[PDB]
Amino acid sequence: APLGPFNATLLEQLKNDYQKGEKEVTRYIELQEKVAEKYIKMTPLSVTAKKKLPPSKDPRDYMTLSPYWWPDSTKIDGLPYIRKDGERNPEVYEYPERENANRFGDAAYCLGVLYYITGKEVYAKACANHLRTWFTDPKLGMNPNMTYAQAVPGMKKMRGSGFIDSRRFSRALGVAKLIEGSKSWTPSDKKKLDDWATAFCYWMENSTQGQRESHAANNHGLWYEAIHLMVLAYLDRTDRIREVAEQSILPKMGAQIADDGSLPQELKRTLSLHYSTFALEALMEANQITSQIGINLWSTPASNGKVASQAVDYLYPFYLNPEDWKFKQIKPFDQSRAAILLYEAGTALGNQKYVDTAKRIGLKYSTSDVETIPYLVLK
Amino acid sequence: SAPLGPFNATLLEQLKNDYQKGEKEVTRYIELQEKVAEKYIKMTPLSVTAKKKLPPSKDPRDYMTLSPYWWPDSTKIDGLPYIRKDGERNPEVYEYPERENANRFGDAAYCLGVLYYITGKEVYAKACANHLRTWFTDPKLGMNPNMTYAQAVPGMKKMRGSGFIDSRRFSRALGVAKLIEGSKSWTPSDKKKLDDWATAFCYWMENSTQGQRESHAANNHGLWYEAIHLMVLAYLDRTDRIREVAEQSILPKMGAQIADDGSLPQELKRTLSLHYSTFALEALMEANQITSQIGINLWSTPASNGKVASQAVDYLYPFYLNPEDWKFKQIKPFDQSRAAILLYEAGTALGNQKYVDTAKRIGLKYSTSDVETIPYLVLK
Ligand SMILES: O=C(O)[C@@H]1O[C@@H](O[C@H]2[C@H](O)[C@H](O)[C@H](O[C@H]3[C@H](O)[C@H](O)[C@H](O)O[C@H]3C(=O)O)O[C@H]2C(=O)O)[C@@H](O)[C@@H](O)[C@@H]1O
Numbered sequence: 220a221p222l223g224p225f226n227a228t229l230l231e232q233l234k235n236d237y238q239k240g241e242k243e244v245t246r247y248i249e250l251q252e253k254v255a256e257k258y259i260k261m262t263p264l265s266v267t268a269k270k271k272l273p274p275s276k277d278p279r280d281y282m283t284l285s286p287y288w289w290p291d292s293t294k295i296d297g298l299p300y301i302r303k304d305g306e307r308n309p310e311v312y313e314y315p316e317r318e319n320a321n322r323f324g325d326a327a328y329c330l331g332v333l334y335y336i337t338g339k340e341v342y343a344k345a346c347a348n349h350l351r352t353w354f355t356d357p358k359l360g361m362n363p364n365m366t367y368a369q370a371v372p373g374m375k376k377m378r379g380s381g382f383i384d385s386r387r388f389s390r391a392l393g394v395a396k397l398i399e400g401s402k403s404w405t406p407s408d409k410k411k412l413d414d415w416a417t418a419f420c421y422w423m424e425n426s427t428q429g430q431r432e433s434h435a436a437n438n439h440g441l442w443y444e445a446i447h448l449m450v451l452a453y454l455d456r457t458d459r460i461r462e463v464a465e466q467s468i469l470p471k472m473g474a475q476i477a478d479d480g481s482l483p484q485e486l487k488r489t490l491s492l493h494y495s496t497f498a499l500e501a502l503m504e505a506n507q508i509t510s511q512i513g514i515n516l517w518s519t520p521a522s523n524g525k526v527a528s529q530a531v532d533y534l535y536p537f538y539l540n541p542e543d544w545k546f547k548q549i550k551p552f553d554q555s556r557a558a559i560l561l562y563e564a565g566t567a568l569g570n571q572k573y574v575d576t577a578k579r580i581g582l583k584y585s586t587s588d589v590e591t592i593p594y595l596v597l598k
Numbered sequence: 599s600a601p602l603g604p605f606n607a608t609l610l611e612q613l614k615n616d617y618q619k620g621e622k623e624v625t626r627y628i629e630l631q632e633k634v635a636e637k638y639i640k641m642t643p644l645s646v647t648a649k650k651k652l653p654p655s656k657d658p659r660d661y662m663t664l665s666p667y668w669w670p671d672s673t674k675i676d677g678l679p680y681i682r683k684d685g686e687r688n689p690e691v692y693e694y695p696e697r698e699n700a701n702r703f704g705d706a707a708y709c710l711g712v713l714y715y716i717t718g719k720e721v722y723a724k725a726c727a728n729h730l731r732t733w734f735t736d737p738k739l740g741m742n743p744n745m746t747y748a749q750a751v752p753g754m755k756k757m758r759g760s761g762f763i764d765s766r767r768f769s770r771a772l773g774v775a776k777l778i779e780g781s782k783s784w785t786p787s788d789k790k791k792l793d794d795w796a797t798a799f800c801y802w803m804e805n806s807t808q809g810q811r812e813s814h815a816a817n818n819h820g821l822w823y824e825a826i827h828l829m830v831l832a833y834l835d836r837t838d839r840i841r842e843v844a845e846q847s848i849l850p851k852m853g854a855q856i857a858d859d860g861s862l863p864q865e866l867k868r869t870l871s872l873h874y875s876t877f878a879l880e881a882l883m884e885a886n887q888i889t890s891q892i893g894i895n896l897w898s899t900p901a902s903n904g905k906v907a908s909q910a911v912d913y914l915y916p917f918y919l920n921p922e923d924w925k926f927k928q929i930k931p932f933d934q935s936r937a938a939i940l941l942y943e944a945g946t947a948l949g950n951q952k953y954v955d956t957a958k959r960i961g962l963k964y965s966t967s968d969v970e971t972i973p974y975l976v977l978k
């Protein structure tokens with residue numbers, strides 16, 4: 220499979236069994252095709268579909284509200300907003316690209332993966348329509364920056380924390396590699412998207428917000444590099460992937476994993492079991508890419524000997540019994556998010572207990588959740 | 599005496615008197631409230647018709663919302679029929695603009711009407727009236743007097759009345775319209791149209807199948823149904839029905855929902871059981887504000903089965919002191935501040951000084967813009 224943001228071993232396995240006519244996989248993929256029909260019909264979304272413009276006056280600039288920031292009722296105008304960690308302010312739904320970037324990413328990811336498995340041009344054609352409109356269209360495509368992501372009303376300082384919103388469309392950028400060679404994805408489409416991704420990568424690496432987010436000491440820094448690797452893999456910069464893993468990701472794990480395997484930065488959050496998991500999910504998506512060029516992020520040590528498997532070990536009994544979690548968790552933890560994580564970490568580590576638990580938790584066979592498409596092994 | 603309506607009339611009367619006498623503490627407080635209310639003077643009046651997705655009637659004037667705990671079923675190709683996840687609000691609710699717009703309207707109209715009653719400034723009555731006309735009576739922008747499509751659920755086959763509870767945000771604004779009668783801005787023609795709207799809404803509430811079913815609900819839905827009912831009846835000056843509703847529906851429902859230890863078993867089985875225990879009593883509290891203005895105290899009057907609402911407060915009081923000791927499901931954090939007004943209301947009605955003290959110790963923030971706290975300077 221081409222380099223991209225997915226378990227390549229599982230995708231290659233699905234395509235091969237589908238091409239041999241294997242009954243269980245053929246039936247599974249035929250279910251997924253029924254699920255994907257809505258994305259063939261879906262009108263492509265654009266970041267420009269908003270009324271309230273960002274301070275640039277440019278509808279092509281992505282803008283969202285940082286989700287944990289609320290108006291202050293003791294201020295006459297509610298300004299400046301104040302932080303309530305773990306409490307999502309419903310005002311976030313006033314910025315259409317918060318949910319539309321998710322809907323776009325799901326649509327393009329599903330369609331590109333189904334084109335890779337089946338070879339049906341109808342999937343590449345629809346994938347291409349979503350990609351062109353979200354990324355490259357000179358009127359409807361988004362500017363390659365995250366300047367106004369997770370803005371906060373009244374906040375004086377610039378922040379890079381909104382960059383983490385990019386993971387919702389950077390997975391779609393990576394899956395675009397899967398539709399290269401189709402009739403629908405022309406050399407002109409590829410050149411424009413190569414150019415967009417080059418500009419997005421430039422902004423990521425050199426803007427102040429990008430720089431600050433690259434140095435964040437919690438899951439923001441881990442997710443930044445997961446996104447970075449998606450952009451770099453799209454652009455075939457395998458040398459850069461090696462450098463990022465060795466000079467950013469591994470040092471970050473070494474600093475963020477404690478000696479007992481806990482993630483102290485996540486333990487002080489109000490949703491601490493969720494944010495411990497979210498950190499490892501960032502490592503999990505990074506590893507899907509690094510392991511396609513021979514770097515296993517679950518078992519490769521930092522310079523201090525700490526390994527990401529130690530973080531899984533610490534959390535494993537709490538994936539078995541979330542009720543035993545002893546740190547602040549002000550909403551219930553969804554055990555199901557452990558399923559793909561424990562499968563990913565278990566296979567990478569040869570840890571059969573992890574894989575068994577991933578299957579016992581499982582995923583629903585007929586779920587339409589697009590990220591579960593490769594994981595028939597869990598359904 | 600203040601007009602009959604959905605507010606603590608004793609505190610409102612005391613604010614108006616002190617304000618007219620020039621008392622410093624009250625004058626300063628009301629001047630803050632006036633600064634707060636300025637955004638409502640400028641605010642463009644909202645309308646239920648400001649939606650794109652129309653309801654099955656094809657009438658933009660029909661109120662329609664999504665029942666908040668119902669979600670697409672990902673294991674179905676079209677996600678239909680939706681399934682219930684108690685206590686987990688599905689963000690799709692924000693696709694129906696009147697969910698939050700009925701809230702914003704209710705806040706604007708309540709604040710402006712209360713401030714006209716306290717200050718006598720015509721500017722507050724004029725703005726209040728603009729919001730009322732647009733939301734209720736306007737022949738194009740005003741809502742139809744029903745809740746047929748409130749809290750609909752995609753794929754659900756049966757009709758439900760559970761969405762009626764959405765009415766409490768605008769029925770409080772209806773009640774406060776009584777406060778602007780006599781202003782120059784609220785004409786006799788305006789009052790007549792709103793009287794006719796409220797009469798039609800009252801008919802729908804009482805005689806539609808959805809209204810009848812909600813009137814029979816065995817949990818906080820039944821209590822909120824009658825709290826809303828009293829607001830409509832008080833707006834219409836039907837003091838006879840207020841007495842009958844209190845004696846024949848509210849007290850028997852309240853008595854039937856209270857267990858031997860004072861707990862509310864219908865609310866204890868919810869995923870937000872401390873919230874829904876509190877929410878049940880808030881319905882009784884708002885109901886009592888109206889009944890006690892004609893001499894019926896719902897906190898201390900026993901039902902015919904011997905149960906009295908004070909017993910429910912007694913059960914919950916230690917958990918307002920320490921919400922973490924709550925031993926039932928509460929999958930999101932409980933806001934202790936919601937205990938403040940509840941304990942003041944129940945404490946004052948019962949002569950329980952322990953409750954009132956706790957109410958002030960928890961307190962409300964002096965400068966808050968929350969319109970429901972306007973009468974409660976005693977807590978600020
Ligand atoms: O005030 C409230 O409790 C409201 O809660 C939500 O309504 C709930 C509530 O449990 C209702 O009593 C009703 O429950 C029904 C329903 O059939 C439910 O599916 C289950 O079978 O129990 C029934 C019962 O208790 O008799 O509807 C529930 C629902 O989520 O639809 C909402 O109305 C909410 O807005 C309000 O806060």
Ligand SMILES: O=C(O)C1=C[C@H](O)[C@H](O)[C@H](O[C@H]2[C@H](O)[C@H](O)[C@H](O[C@H]3[C@H](O)[C@H](O)[C@H](O)O[C@H]3C(=O)O)O[C@H]2C(=O)O)O1
Nearest residue numbers: 285286287288302304369380381383435437438439494497
């Ligand atoms: O942790 C996440 O991945 C995350 C996702 C949400 O979308 C949102 O970005 C949220 O971010 C919060 C997290 O604490 C960030 O690390 C940052 O925290 C900074 C913030 O200014 C905070 O008040 C304090 O100063 O810590 C800062 C830091 O850099 O640690 O933003 C948080 C926020 O809620 O904005 O979590």
